[PDB]
Design a binder for this molecule. Structure first.
Ligand SMILES: Cc1cc2nc3c(=O)[nH]c(=O)nc-3n(C[C@H](O)[C@H](O)[C@H](O)COP(=O)(O)OP(=O)(O)OC[C@H]3O[C@@H](n4cnc5c(N)ncnc54)[C@H](O)[C@@H]3O)c2cc1C
Ligand SMILES: Cc1cc2nc3c(=O)[nH]c(=O)nc-3n(C[C@H](O)[C@H](O)[C@H](O)COP(=O)(O)OP(=O)(O)OC[C@H]3O[C@@H](n4cnc5c(N)ncnc54)[C@H](O)[C@@H]3O)c2cc1C
Ligand SMILES: *SC[C@H](NC(=O)CC[C@H](N)C(=O)O)C(=O)NCC(=O)O
Ligand SMILES: *SC[C@H](NC(=O)CC[C@H](N)C(=O)O)C(=O)NCC(=O)O
Ligand SMILES: N[C@@H](CCC(=O)N[C@@H](CS)C(=O)NCC(=O)O)C(=O)O
Ligand SMILES: N[C@@H](CCC(=O)N[C@@H](CS)C(=O)NCC(=O)O)C(=O)O
Lengths: 462, 462
C-alpha cells in the first residue's frame, strides 16, 4: 500500500521545515520525514548552539575590560559545564517548538530514514512503509568532512563541529584545522574561553574567499586575540599519546624550506575543512537523480532536479550554505508549486553573511576583485575606513573596525559592502536591503548619520 | 579696522565646525569664533561623554549575567572616579583633534564671545576687534533649561546634564525630572551604576512623542531595570537638608486625588526638562534678526535668517536637535554658498534617531498615528513583533525586543520603523538608507535574512 500526499519533504531542517510550512499554508497535504531531531543542523549542531557559545566568548572578552570601566576585576575561571547544560536545554526547547509548528500546521511527521524506491512514479520508503506525492523535496543537508585514514593516518582521532557540541569540558589545548568561517568561529570561541588554541591554515590568511581587506583583518585580529595562526601548514599524521594527541605538521612557507613539526599534548583536534552532502543512502540511482562528483544534488534556478516532480534545496545542493538561504529557497519553491507562481525562485546574488569572529564580520555583494572582473578596473571605485570604536577609548585592550564600500560605474552603484568590527553583526541587514534595491553611494550619503555609532561611518565615507 | 573673510562662523560645535571645514574645502577664507571649547556640546557635554557613560552602564548590566554564562560572579563595586578621569581625557584628546582640523584647513580660530554690531553691513565684535563677511553663520547651540525660582523655589539646588558631567562621585540617591530622551538616558545610566534612582514624569509614559509602542515599552523597561517612574508627578519646591535635598512633589493621577509627597535624602536632582537656545547675548536686535518667543533663530528651508547674508544651523534653530543634523545642514549650506548649488539643503524628513536606553531604541520616519493622519486609516498597515533575544536564552535577567514597521498605500511603502532591543543602536542606519530610498515592504522581504540575529526579524515580518 502507498500513502499519497501533495508534498513529501525529506529532511526536517531549515529548508524542509520552511518549505513544508509554506506549502501547508497554501493548502497542500504535506508530510516531513526526519530521521533525527527536528530543526536539523541550525537548531542542533549549527547556528543556534554556535551563537550561544559566541555570546559566552563575547562576554568573556568584554569582562577583560571590567577594571578599565571602573569595576573591581572579575578574577574568575569559566565553567564549561554550566553553559553546556543551558545550551542543551535551549536546543531541547527548540526541538519541541518545531515539532509543534508542524503539528499545528497539520503536517504529518514521519520518523525514520527515507530512501527512494525503483517505482517509476517517485516513491520513498521509510521503515518499510511507502509514500508518494507529485512533488518531493530533498532537503537532507550535509555533514562535516573528515580526512580519510589513507591520506592522514589517525585523522579519526580528531573531532568535527558535531563533536564540538558534545564536549563536556573546555579542552586545555586545541588545534583547529581549516580556514573558512566555521574554523574561524570555533577557534575564536575556544581561545576566548581559555583554551591554548592554534588555527592551522594552508596559506597565509583565513577567509580567502572574502574581500581581501576582510581576509587580512580577520587574520590579524585572530593573532591579536591570542590564536596561534599556523600558516602554510598541513597535518600529516595524528597519534594518540599518554596526554591527548600528537599532531605531525608540515609547514612550507614560500621562500623557505619545508619543515616537519610535532605538536604535543593536544586535547582537541578539530577538523573544519568542509562539508559533504547527505545523499549516499538515498538510493538516488533508483530514479537516475543527478549528482556532482561530491554527492551534491544538481538543480536548476527553480530547484528542480533532473527528474520531474523532484526538487532539492539547502545544503544538499552545495550552494550558499546558510540557514536563511535554505528557508528562502524552500518558501519560493512552495509558492511556485502550490500558488502556481512560475517565476517564484530565490535570487542567489546579494545574499548577506555574518561571521561570528571577534569582532564579527559582515559582508554583502561583490568583493573588490570580483567587481573589477565584472565591471572593469576603470569602472570600480572603492571607499574605505579604519578606526578604533569609541567603546575602546577607555580600554587597554583594542579591536579595530574596518569598512569597505565597492562602487561600480559613473553612478557609483554600491555593489559590495565589507566590514569587521563591534556591532557589525547587527549592522548589516539594513545595508543589505539597500544594496538589494540598487542603492548608489549618493543614496547612502543622502541618509543622515546616527551619532555616536560605528554604523554612521558607512554613510560618511569620502 | 575690520578684518574681512568669505565666511564667519559663530560657534565651534558640530554645525559650525562642519560648515567651516566644507566651505574651506571649496576655497572660502573662513574663521570660527569659539568662546569655550572646540567641539561644542557633542564633544564636551553631550553625545561623546554620554556614550562613554552608556558603555559603562551597559557593561555593568551585562556583568549581572556573568554567573549565568558560566563565570564566577563579579561581586565588585563601581568606582565613578576611574571612568570620570578616562572620560575627561578622551574629551581633551577630541578638543585637540578638532583644533588641529581647523588649523590644517587654514581656518582661523577666533577665541572669545561674538556679538553683532549695529553696522548696516553685518559685522561682529569679539574682544573689541571687528570682523565681517558676506556670509555669517550663527551656530551657537543651546543649553539646558532650569525652572525659575518664582515657579519652583529651590530649583537652583538641582543640576542639569552639564552638571552631570562635572559629578566626581556616584550619587547615592538620584531624582531625574523629565520624560524626553536626555532624562531617560541619564536615569538609566545612574540606575545601572548603582544610584537609587527615580524618574519624575508629567504623564504616564516616557518618550510620548515617539511611536506609542516605544513609549510603552521604554517605560516598562525602565521599571523592570529598577528605575522608579513617578507618574503624573511635578516638583513644587526643593530645600537643602542636612543630607542632600528634600524634593516636594505633587502627584495627580487621573481618577485619584492630588497628593503631596516629600522625597528626602536626595543627593542628585537633575532637571532634564528641555533646552534653550544660546542667543541672548548675540545682540541680534542690532540687525533685526528674527527669533521666536523662546529665542530660537528663525530660518527658511535653506537656513537663511530674515537678514541677507546671515544664516543659522543646529540647536540654535530648535528643530531636530541632533549632531548629524547640525553637520548635514552646515555642509549643505556650504555647498549652496561656496559651490553655488542653489538647491542644496537638508531634507528634515526621515532623520533617524537612537536613544541610548537599556536596551537602546531606534526610530526613523512616521509613527503609526502620524501615518494615519497623513495617509488615512484605511491606507496604513502595521506589522510588529515582540521577542526575547537569544542572548537571554541562558540568563535569569531579561530584556525584550519590540519592532514595528509602518506601511502606507497599496504598495506598502515603509514610512516608519520603530524598535527597542539589544543591537538596535547599530541596526538602524542601514534601514534608514532603505527608508530614504522609498523601500516597500516587498523590498525588505526580498532581502535574505542574516541568522541568528535580531535584525533579521525586520525582514521576516508577516
Ligand atoms: C557549526 C555550524 C555553524 C553554522 N553557522 C551558521 C550561521 O551562523 N548562520 C547560517 O545562516 N548558517 C550557519 N550554518 C549553516 C546552516 O546551519 C545550514 O546552512 C542549514 O542548517 C542547512 O539547512 P538544510 O535544511 O539544508 O539542512 P539540515 O538542517 O542539515 O537538515 C537536514 C535534515 O535532514 C535529516 N535527514 C538527512 N537525511 C535524511 C533521510 N534520508 N531521511 C530523513 N531525514 C534525513 C537530517 O537528520 C536533518 O535534520 C552553520 C552550520 C554549522 C555546521
Ligand atoms: C546630554 C546630551 C546628550 C546628547 N546625545 C546626543 C546623541 O547621542 N546623538 C546626537 O546626535 N545628539 C545628541 N545630543 C545633541 C547634540 O549634542 C547637539 O544637537 C549638537 O551638539 C548641537 O550642535 P550645534 O553646533 O548646534 O551646537 P553646540 O555644539 O552647542 O555648539 C555651539 C558652540 O557655540 C559656542 N558659542 C555659543 N555662543 C557663542 C558666541 N556668541 N560666541 C562664540 N562662541 C559661542 C559654544 O561655546 C559652543 O561650543 C545630545 C546633547 C546633550 C546635551
Ligand atoms: S535554527 C531554526 C531556524 N529558524 C530561523 O532561521 C528563523 C526563521 C525566521 N523566523 C523566518 O524566516 O521566519 C529554522 O530552521 N526555521 C525553519 C522555520 O520554518 O522557521
Ligand atoms: S562629537 C564631534 C562630532 N563628530 C561627528 O559627529 C562625527 C562626524 C562624521 N565623522 C562625519 O560626518 O564626517 C563633530 O562635531 N564633528 C564636526 C566635524 O567637522 O566632523
Ligand atoms: N563613529 C565611531 C568612531 C568614533 C568617532 O566618531 N570619533 C564611533 O562612534 O566609534
Ligand atoms: N532571531 C532572533 C530571535 C530568536 C529566534 O530566531 N529564535 C534572535 O536571534 O534573537
Amino acid at each position: 500500500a502507498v500513502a499519497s500526499y501533495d508534498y513529501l519533504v525529506i529532511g526536517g531542517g531549515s529548508g524542509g521545515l520552511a518549505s513544508a510550512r509554506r506549502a501547508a499554508e497554501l493548502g497542500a497535504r504535506a508530510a516531513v520525514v526526519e530521521s533525527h531531531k527536528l530543526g536539523g543542523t541550525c537548531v542542533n549542531v549549527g547556528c543556534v548552539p554556535k551563537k550561544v557559545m559566541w555570546n559566552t566568548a563575547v562576554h568573556s572578552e568584554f569582562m577583560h575590560d571590567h577594571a578599565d570601566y571602573g569595576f573591581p576585576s572579575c578574577e574568575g575561571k569559566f565553567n564549561w559545564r554550566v553553559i553546556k547544560e543551558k545550551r542543551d536545554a535551549y536546543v531541547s526547547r527548540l526541538n519541541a517548538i518545531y515539532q509543534n509548528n508542524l503539528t499545528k500546521s497539520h503536517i504529518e511527521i514521519i520518523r525514520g530514514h527515507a530512501a527512494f524506491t525503483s517505482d517509476p512514479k517517485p516513491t520513498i520508503e521509510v521503515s518499510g512503509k511507502k509514500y508518494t506525492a507529485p512533488h518531493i523535496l530533498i532537503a537532507t543537508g550535509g555533514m562535516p568532512s573528515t580526512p580519510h585514514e589513507s591520506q592522514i593516518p589517525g585523522a579519526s582521532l580528531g573531532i568535527t563541529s558535531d563533536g564540538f557540541f558534545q564536549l563536556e569540558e573546555l579542552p586545555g589545548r586545541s588545534v583547529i584545522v581549516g580556514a573558512g568561517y566555521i574554523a574561524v568561529e570555533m577557534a575564536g570561541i575556544l581561545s576566548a574561553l581559555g583554551s591554548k588554541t592554534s588555527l592551522m591554515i594552508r596559506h597565509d590568511k583565513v577567509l580567502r574567499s572574502f574581500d581581501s581587506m576582510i581576509s587580512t583583518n580577520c587574520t590579524e585580529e585572530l593573532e591579536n586575540a591570542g590564536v596561534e595562526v599556523l600558516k602554510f601548514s598541513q597535518v600529516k599524521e595524528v597519534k594518540k599519546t599518554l596526554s591527548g594527541l600528537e599532531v605531525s605538521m608540515v609547514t612550507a612557507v614560500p621562500g623557505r624550506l619545508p619543515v616537519m613539526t610535532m605538536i604535543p599534548d593536544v586535547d582537541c583536534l578539530l577538523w573544519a575543512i568542509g562539508r559533504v552532502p547527505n545523499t549516499k543512502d538515498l538510493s538516488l540511482n533508483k530514479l537516475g537523480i543527478q549528482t556532482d562528483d561530491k554527492g551534491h544534488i544538481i538543480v536548476d534556478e527553480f530547484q528542480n532536479t533532473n527528474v520531474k516532480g523532484i526538487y532539492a534545496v539547502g545544503d544538499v545542493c552545495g550552494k550558499a550554505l546558510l540557514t536563511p538561504v535554505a528557508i528562502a529557497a524552500g518558501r519560493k519553491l512552495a509558492h511556485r508549486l502550490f500558488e502556481y507562481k512560475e517565476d517564484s525562485k530565490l535570487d542567489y546574488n546579494n545574499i548577506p553573511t555574518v561571521v561570528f569572529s571577534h569582532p564579527p564580520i559582515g559582508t554583502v555583494g561583490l568583493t573588490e576583485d570580483e567587481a573589477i572582473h565584472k565591471y572593469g578596473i576603470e569602472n570600480v571605485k572603492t571607499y574605505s575606513t579604519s578606526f578604533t570604536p569609541m567603546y575602546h577609548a577607555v580600554t587597554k585592550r583594542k579591536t579595530k573596525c574596518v569598512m569597505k564600500m565597492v562602487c561600480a560605474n559613473k553612478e557609483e552603484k554600491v555593489v559590495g559592502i565589507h566590514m569587521q568590527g563591534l556591532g557589525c553583526d547587527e549592522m548589516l541587514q539594513g545595508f543589505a536591503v539597500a544594496v538589494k534595491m540598487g542603492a548608489t553611494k549618493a543614496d547612502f550619503d543622502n541618509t543622515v548619520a546616527i551619532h555616536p555609532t560605528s554604523s554612521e561611518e558607512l554613510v560618511t565615507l569620502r
